[PDB]
Design an enzyme around this catalytic site. Structure first.
Site, PDB file in Angstrom:
ATOM      1  CG  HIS A  66      12.216 -46.196  19.380  1.00  0.00           C
ATOM      2  ND1 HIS A  66      13.335 -46.937  20.269  1.00  0.00           N
ATOM      3  CD2 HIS A  66      12.077 -45.161  20.106  1.00  0.00           C
ATOM      4  CE1 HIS A  66      13.498 -46.292  21.287  1.00  0.00           C
ATOM      5  NE2 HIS A  66      12.672 -45.203  21.522  1.00  0.00           N
ATOM      6  CG  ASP A  98      10.176 -44.408  23.232  1.00  0.00           C
ATOM      7  OD1 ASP A  98      11.041 -44.996  23.829  1.00  0.00           O
ATOM      8  OD2 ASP A  98      10.168 -43.687  22.545  1.00  0.00           O
ATOM      9  CG  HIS A 144       8.581 -40.021  26.896  1.00  0.00           C
ATOM     10  ND1 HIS A 144       8.556 -41.505  26.726  1.00  0.00           N
ATOM     11  CD2 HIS A 144       9.519 -39.753  25.804  1.00  0.00           C
ATOM     12  CE1 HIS A 144       9.417 -41.835  26.065  1.00  0.00           C
ATOM     13  NE2 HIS A 144      10.257 -41.117  25.475  1.00  0.00           N
TER      14      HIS A 144
HETATM   15  C1  H2Z Z   1      11.665 -38.941  22.455  1.00  0.00           C
HETATM   16  C2  H2Z Z   1      12.387 -40.033  21.522  1.00  0.00           C
HETATM   17  C3  H2Z Z   1      13.435 -39.597  20.900  1.00  0.00           C
HETATM   18  C4  H2Z Z   1      14.508 -39.248  21.911  1.00  0.00           C
HETATM   19  N1  H2Z Z   1      15.655 -38.565  21.067  1.00  0.00           N
HETATM   20  C5  H2Z Z   1      16.289 -39.633  20.116  1.00  0.00           C
HETATM   21  C6  H2Z Z   1      17.552 -38.664  19.997  1.00  0.00           C
HETATM   22  C7  H2Z Z   1      18.685 -38.706  18.881  1.00  0.00           C
HETATM   23  C8  H2Z Z   1      19.444 -37.559  19.236  1.00  0.00           C
HETATM   24  C9  H2Z Z   1      20.622 -37.117  18.753  1.00  0.00           C
HETATM   25  C10 H2Z Z   1      21.618 -36.877  18.193  1.00  0.00           C
HETATM   26  C11 H2Z Z   1      23.019 -36.547  17.660  1.00  0.00           C
HETATM   27  C12 H2Z Z   1      23.096 -37.162  16.417  1.00  0.00           C
HETATM   28  C13 H2Z Z   1      24.446 -36.820  15.758  1.00  0.00           C
HETATM   29  C14 H2Z Z   1      25.253 -35.857  16.138  1.00  0.00           C
HETATM   30  C15 H2Z Z   1      26.734 -35.337  15.532  1.00  0.00           C
HETATM   31  N2  H2Z Z   1      27.737 -35.817  16.374  1.00  0.00           N
HETATM   32  C16 H2Z Z   1      27.883 -35.485  17.740  1.00  0.00           C
HETATM   33  C17 H2Z Z   1      29.295 -35.838  18.368  1.00  0.00           C
HETATM   34  O1  H2Z Z   1      29.355 -37.524  18.278  1.00  0.00           O
HETATM   35  C18 H2Z Z   1      29.469 -37.900  16.779  1.00  0.00           C
HETATM   36  C19 H2Z Z   1      28.087 -37.438  16.181  1.00  0.00           C
HETATM   37  C20 H2Z Z   1      24.855 -34.835  17.382  1.00  0.00           C
HETATM   38  C21 H2Z Z   1      23.715 -35.570  18.136  1.00  0.00           C
HETATM   39  C22 H2Z Z   1      18.844 -36.884  20.504  1.00  0.00           C
HETATM   40  N3  H2Z Z   1      17.800 -37.652  20.733  1.00  0.00           N
HETATM   41  C23 H2Z Z   1      16.363 -37.498  21.658  1.00  0.00           C
HETATM   42  O2  H2Z Z   1      16.220 -36.704  22.342  1.00  0.00           O
HETATM   43  C24 H2Z Z   1      12.427 -41.516  22.401  1.00  0.00           C
HETATM   44  O3  H2Z Z   1      12.840 -42.605  21.657  1.00  0.00           O
HETATM   45  N4  H2Z Z   1      12.364 -41.404  23.736  1.00  0.00           N
HETATM   46  O4  H2Z Z   1      12.504 -42.409  24.448  1.00  0.00           O
HETATM   47  S1  H2Z Z   1      11.080 -40.390  20.271  1.00  0.00           S
HETATM   48  C25 H2Z Z   1      11.626 -41.494  19.038  1.00  0.00           C
HETATM   49  O5  H2Z Z   1      10.518 -39.054  19.708  1.00  0.00           O
HETATM   50  O6  H2Z Z   1       9.890 -40.898  21.055  1.00  0.00           O
HETATM   51 ZN    ZN Z   2      12.658 -44.237  22.911  1.00  0.00          ZN
END
Ligand code: H2Z
Ligand code: ZN
EC number: 3.5.1.108
Length: 299
Positions: A237, A241, A264
């Site tokens: 992933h 990204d 990012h």
């Molecule tokens: C920056 C990242 C991650 C970015 N992310 C991944 C990500 C997942 C997330 C969430 C959630 C969540 C889950 C369960 C529940 C419970 N209910 C909620 C109501 O409906 C039923 C489930 C509520 C919220 C927020 N979030 C986010 O900000 C990316 O891929 N960038 O492109 S990385 C991998 O770090 O590089």
């Molecule tokens: Zn991502």
């Protein structure tokens, strides 16, 4: 010659913003030669066009956000990864709202919708950015580097001291000579940790998030019931990204990216340093597909 590509047909998707939780209509349209990827907010008067370029990056907290004025297009990285991985040069991306839909948290839905519509080669030479000189940026233990490389290769290492991570699953190297964006990277979903997600939820962030659009990891396990798409889905992933962020250069890269715990913010600092360092890169074209170091799938 290797030709610029756009869409053969209009593509349409509906979903929800991961961060905003807003329902959004996404419309991908063909675009002329040398347009680049250009996001349009069709919910505004007048409609505000934001080229997908490094110079239009604002916020790089939990996503890559483009800004023109105070008009935002949030979470462009997975869609741009799809665009980059299929070699789209020119395309208008119309949104009805401030965030790109999260879909399944991967680039898979976007690659499928684009390849459903087909690509159109246009009668202009595809321009590539060739890395001539190593450029690296660092901030604490995070690092991101462009190295000269006759092809397109992305390497990424994560470092989580966590029961789910501990193994060779924390580093991967993909050479797009050898290995298909579509099959090996495109389906890798976004991920977050339960305590960080609870924090975000406490701040009314992550409003569109769920196990249907993200891998949720607690202290010990993957919470998602149905499993991982890839043994190394997490690092794949981050590679996805990186490919999306890199595409903010506006052209396919002939070069290698190496990321260590990059995100990012550092990817954008890498692009800005590369751009600034005019000796480290040159624009090239290929009169002859057969001599090119990159082969893209047939349109
Ligand atoms: C920056 C990242 C991650 C970015 N992310 C991944 C990500 C997942 C997330 C969430 C959630 C969540 C889950 C369960 C529940 C419970 N209910 C909620 C109501 O409906 C039923 C489930 C509520 C919220 C927020 N979030 C986010 O900000 C990316 O891929 N960038 O492109 S990385 C991998 O770090 O590089
Ligand atoms: Zn991502």
């Amino acid at each position: 010659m290797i030709k610029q590509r756009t869409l053969k047909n209009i593509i349409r998707a509906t979903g929800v913003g991961l961060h905003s939780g807003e329902k959004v209509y996404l419309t991908l349209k063909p675009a002329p030669v040398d347009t680049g990827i250009v996001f349009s907010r069709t919910d505004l008067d007048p409609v505000v066009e934001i080229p997908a370029r490094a110079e239009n990056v604002g916020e790089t907290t939990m996503s890559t956000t483009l800004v023109k004025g105070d008009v935002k297009v949030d979470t462009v990285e997975h869609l741009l990864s799809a665009m980059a991985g299929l070699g789209i040069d020119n395309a208008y991306v119309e949104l009805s709202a401030s965030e790109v839909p999260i879909m399944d948290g991967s680039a898979g839905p976007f690659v499928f919708l684009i390849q459903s519509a087909g690509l159109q080669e246009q009668e202009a030479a595809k321009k590539f950015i060739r890395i001539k000189r190593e450029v690296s940026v660092e901030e604490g233990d995070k690092r991101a580097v462009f190295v000269p490389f006759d092809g397109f290769k992305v390497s990424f290492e994560i470092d989580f001291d966590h029961p789910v991570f501990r193994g060779r699953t924390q580093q991967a190297s993909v050479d797009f000579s050898s290995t298909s964006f579509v099959k090996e990277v495109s389906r890798a979903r976004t991920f977050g940790f339960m305590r960080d997600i609870e924090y975000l939820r406490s701040q009314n962030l992550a409003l569109g998030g769920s196990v249907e659009n993200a891998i949720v990891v607690d202290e010990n396990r993957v919470l998602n019931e149905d499993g991982l798409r890839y043994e190394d889905e997490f690092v794949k992933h981050k590679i996805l990204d990186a490919i999306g962020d890199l595409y903010l250069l506006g052209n396919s890269l002939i070069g290698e990216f190496r990321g260590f715990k990059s995100g990012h913010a550092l990817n954008n600092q890498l692009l800005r340093t590369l751009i600034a360092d005019k000796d480290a890169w040159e624009v090239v074209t290929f009169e002859d597909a057969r001599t090119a170091p990159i082969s893209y799938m047939r349109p």
